[PDB]
Homo-oligomer: 254 residues x 4
């Protein structure tokens, strides 16, 4: 029951974004929501998508995580429009496509530092800024993948980028824990999102999950969302620095 | 909302038990509850505590998990008496005092196997019999300690038993996954229960947690129960074979 | 590595395909004196025949059924009398009933479960307590594990719970015996066609998977375990305790 | 016995370096060694460390790993001067102290990506260029710290770089496995080296080891070299993507 609660959701591109699953679940549970976006596709788009929700008013902010200025000013503006918040759902990453379908040993320095910047550092800077709006504490969640933990074929540079995120979570949880702010991750199983298009060896995973994972099925964005409701609410008080696998138990098998 | 849900809670001994933390939370949420005990002692207790709960009917069953008969015939009586359930909270462990204050290399064989019997194997037989009452699926949750992943001073044989329980949870997960039974653990941080009582200076991993955990506090039974409610309900739906730490972040640090 | 003037007790040779034998060949190649324990008479006969491949001028065989306190106690006492102090122990011993491996994991009998815990895990503890007595300046104790102790592996079942138990056992003994300069470590060998795999479903299909999916594209063998064991058992690993080395062509590190 | 073997060693600063402990071990075992340095300071130092060693006409090379070209041309010059190698020991990382002095949440973007650059990607590019000189296969090892796996107090942005490194080592292992190149990490305990010199959190942990690690002592650079020699040799064939902890058992307790 999330009435009276306010969350910022970052990383909705369209109806298939993991973050849209998050949105729908907190909306249903009565949370006030705030959204951020990178460009103008996610802009008109988002507006249309929020007609699916039950938000009295549309708080959207253009934040590109590569600018410190846009993250600092963006969160400050959110503060001025909606007051204090109770949490942030981080759902932002990027790797160059070429770096995923070539050999990991061939990853450019640019492609590598690029994926670090967007997929991992974003969360540090966003967490420093969002902290200003959480005086009595709150909850930050980020979205990761098992490739951060073990080497998965063709995940490559994004795997290194998610290992970095998952350690980010750990260091943020210990830094902000005394300020009563919890920092956790959701390691989601593979889902058919926009970024999932044209990635090498992706749709073979969906299949292998079906055959091998304890639950013999794949997950969906609404499943990630539910666990997100958990991590973002007081139900998870006491739980921080953690990584919850919403993945049909694929993580627990070899 | 867990109305129209029924859960079996194993291992309330008194007001301070971890399992009563779980009970309160789930009762609050409208669930029906079924309780099991070992001792006569823990029964007159169970009856008393029920007065603090919204349970119009006391359903209590004596099950000593050392007995195959008592576990088969107990779950069979639950099922006649109440019907299908939605899952099971397993909060049962034991080790001889004598072995935990000795050096781990001095542990008696009988001590070691008995801790294994009650703390790990009991979940396996419990799962197999509880599955009988879960035709459409459900969720099984066991309680562990960080001493099962890493060597914790003085936890000794119980750590080994907890390691075996975490593995057991993984194998059960993969076995009972195609039956839509999810199996998970909560790794509780230290708590002042009737069990903590004996261990000397147990007060000092207690103090250590205050000083060093990210949240700089110790967790409570109700915080366990809140995470339990997540795992036992449809909220945790894509999560199985997982070990969630309700220990204020203690596991993410060194 | 130079193991001359060093002495090691090797537990769990049963035939020429035993992982403990790949261990024995290598330590022998490096100049170590070796002492052997066996359970079945059939294994003692094997050991006799097998020395003939080794350069062990004196043949030391001891019957130790690790189910028995008395047998472990007396066995290690007799070893002290007969050969004196030792530099480490290789433990290469496990058991699980075949009924429990063919059933679903949920169906495992209590008896099978506890027998698996007793022999595959508890025996490292008693072994370490009595071995320690022969190591007053310290030494190195090594056990063998398998990845199904860390992740649920299909068909490995009760044994997986057993290896999980052993792997914690290694950590608690490392912590307990550290102050006595005794290091305790495990090797997670990849799957190897021993006498003990022979019966087992799931085995032939994991082997193939390793070849196909593990970073090195091949399966490992008993000598490779042996080599890593010489590192663990020697001063080459003087800083290493409570550690689990996967000798498995990198299959642990992928998904 | 690494007779007839050739190894490139990167990151000797002084006689207290970890990489020099490695060098002494490998030199004792009769291996050929190549050195790389950034600062001429470190060259001067190398030049005189050599008298301790039994190398005939030692080859020293400046490689600042922040530079693509110094690294390609560096290894290209090494294949020319001495031909094929059998291995690389990577002992290189950097983080600004002002990132480390502050709370982790205040970490500059710049300081994060530089850490990543120097401490993590430097491995990827090095691997790719050293592959060239290891046609029949070989062995690559790098140096991490337990702060890569867990949040260690004050380790801050380096913990995130080391996490990244650890992932890199795995993903290099899977891409490079088929070309018979093994890739591994050593997780060293704290040692008083040149780069330990300004750092907060160092005495704290160094003392906790003595009191808490199983061996109740801290480790030293030669103990690291011994494990380096194992992984860089045929003794560890079948071992890849692994992180060996040379830290008196500290990694294994909690
Ligand atoms: N799909 C899957 O199977 C899995 C996904 N994940 C993770 O979950 C998260 C959600 O991604 P997903 O829904 O899959 O796909 P999407 O492509 O829907 O969402 C990714 C979002 O990241 C945004 N983004 C990228 N770069 C920046 C930037 N510099 N500043 C701001 N926003 C940026 C994109 O914005 P824009 O579109 O405006 O360019 C987009 O909205 C990611 O972190 C992903 O790694 C984890 C496990 C598996
Ligand atoms: N206390 C703590 O700080 C922590 C505890 N844990 C774990 O939490 C769980 C509950 O612990 P906790 O509440 O602390 O202590 P409690 O003493 O409250 O609960 C232990 C329960 O185990 C029951 N039990 C013991 N042996 C048997 C048996 N043979 N058959 C049936 N039931 C049996 C006891 O019943 P009876 O009293 O009637 O014999 C009792 O109800 C255990 O798994 C424990 O290891 C995990 C992390 C930390
Ligand atoms: N084979 C594989 O693929 C892998 C094996 N392992 C592990 O490696 C170790 C060696 O297995 P492996 O060599 O493959 O098979 P083996 O059968 O060759 O060796 C197992 C040994 O255990 C002994 N043993 C069994 N019960 C007892 C007992 N009560 N007392 C004393 N010794 C006993 C057997 O001797 P006896 O017959 O005389 O009783 C035999 O020597 C085991 O720990 C196994 O779990 C780990 C990873 C993979
Ligand atoms: N000291 C410790 O307690 C521990 C150290 N480690 C790791 O061991 C490794 C070695 O460090 P350590 O021996 O402690 O101390 P050192 O200062 O002796 O070694 C660090 C080396 O990295 C080199 N280096 C730094 N930046 C660059 C660059 N831009 N290009 C090329 N080389 C560079 C330095 O060379 P130059 O001076 O010429 O710029 C220096 O030789 C590091 O990865 C460190 O994180 C791991 C665990 C604990
Ligand atoms: C944002 C982004 C970009 N720029 C490129 C590739 C992937 C992604 C997001 N994404 C999408 C799918 C995903 O699936 C994990 C399963 C896979 C395994 C190997 C390749 S994909 C993980 C994942 O992180
Ligand atoms: C059921 C039981 C029995 N019979 C004996 C000892 C312990 C327990 C339960 N318990 C109790 C306390 C606990 O504390 C975790 C912190 C500790 C570390 C070392 C000793 S206590 C963990 C834990 O598992
Ligand atoms: C000593 C013993 C007994 N008594 C019963 C089962 C297995 C073993 C030995 N063994 C043999 C093979 C092995 O292979 C690991 C690969 C597998 C995966 C699933 C089933 S086997 C591991 C392993 O432990
Ligand atoms: C190369 C570098 C730079 N530039 C800055 C800080 C540290 C280091 C190297 N280093 C040095 C010491 C060390 O000690 C680990 C123990 C600690 C724990 C918390 C703080 S230090 C680990 C470690 O990685």
């Amino acid at each position: 029951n999330l009435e009276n609660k306010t969350y910022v959701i970052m990383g909705i591109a369209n109806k298939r974004s993991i973050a849209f699953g998050v949105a729908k679940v907190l909306d249903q549970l009565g949370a006030k929501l705030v959204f951020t976006y990178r460009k103008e596709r996610s802009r008109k788009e988002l507006e249309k998508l929020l007609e699916q929700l039950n938000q009295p008013e549309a708080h959207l902010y253009q934040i590109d995580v590569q600018s410190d200025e846009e993250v600092i000013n963006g969160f400050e503006q959110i503060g001025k429009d909606v007051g204090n918040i109770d949490g942030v759902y981080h759902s932002i990453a990027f790797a160059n496509m070429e770096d995923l379908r070539g050999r990991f040993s061939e990853t450019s320095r640019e492609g590598f530092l690029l994926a670090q910047d967007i997929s991992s550092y974003s969360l540090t800077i966003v967490a420093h800024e969002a902290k200003k709006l959480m005086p009595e504490g709150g909850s930050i969640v980020a979205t990761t993948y098992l490739g951060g933990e073990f080497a998965v074929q063709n995940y490559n540079v994004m795997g290194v980028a998610k290992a970095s995120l998952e350690a980010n979570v750990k260091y943020l949880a210990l830094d902000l824990g005394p300020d009563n702010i919890r920092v956790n991750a959701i390691s989601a199983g593979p889902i058919r999102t926009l970024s999932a298009k044209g990635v090498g060896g992706f749709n073979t995973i969906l299949k292998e999950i079906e055959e091998r994972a304890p639950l013999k099925r794949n997950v969906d964005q609404v499943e990630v969302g539910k666990t997100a409701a958990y991590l973002l609410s007081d139900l998870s008080s006491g739980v921080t620095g953690e990584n919850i696998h919403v993945d049909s138990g694929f993580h627990a098998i070899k």
